């Protein structure tokens with residue numbers, strides 16, 4: 001499952 | 009795994025420290041940094057890839073030029089886009105612009121992208137020890153903005169995916185009198201930190217550094 005990260 | 013690693017020592021695998029200027033494009037320097045090392049490790053060729061291309065062209069992958077992005081997304085972009093040009097053909101301007109990608113000028117390519125399991129720092133250690141320098145994102149607080157040298161350790165930062173706000177590149181690791189750390193390359197110029205690098209405590213998912221890490225597998 002892909003990375004649902006805040007925009008870094 | 010091994011007690012310490014440093015890709016800069018293994019050979020000419022880590023490119024010089026760069027400067028994102030006033031644009032929040034660290035995610036792009038973390039991306040090029042990871043891909044430059046991968047290509048050099050696999051072929052021995054040392055290239056300098058265009059971060060500006062990512063700033064102007066990677067919007068289809070949820071990236072936002074000077075407003076942010078994620079290395080894994082940028083790796084996928086390069087992959088589907090079939091290439092990234094060198095710094096000498098698509099110069100870093102440091103501001104959001106219009107995409108000027110030329111397919112005939114692409115010099116580095118991505119086959120696949122490996123996403124480290126969320127919060128799996130050990131897996132991150134293996135990737136750095138065995139395969140390539142790793143791109144990761146972490147939460148930067150005021151505590152960190154005061155950094156000069158040494159092993160950064162803080163109680164103010166969070167370790168959650170929605171808090172990470174800066175993208176950097178793990179080039180190795182080691183320990184000092186029992187305190188394990190990571191050797192990290194930044195893109196704020198060579199006059200920042202330790203010649204452009206910084207050490208941060210390893211083993212505690214410090215500032216969420218294992219929340220969103222990835223590295224590319226190049227097409228060579």
Ligand SMILES: *[C@@H]1O[C@H](CO)[C@@H](O[C@@H]2O[C@H](CO)[C@@H](O[C@@H]3O[C@H](CO)[C@@H](O)[C@H](O)[C@@H]3O)[C@H](O)[C@H]2NC(C)=O)[C@H](O)[C@H]1NC(C)=O
Pocket residue numbers: 001002003004068069070080081082084085088121122123
């Ligand atoms: C690692 O994490 C990244 C970021 O979440 C994941 O990126 C996504 O990768 C998929 C392919 O697995 C991309 O889909 C493809 O998009 C292109 C362009 O739209 C399209 O032509 C293809 O048919 C396909 O749909 C997707 O764009 C990309 N998402 C983002 C936001 O970049 C990646 O899947 C993860 N890898 C693994 C192994 O989990």
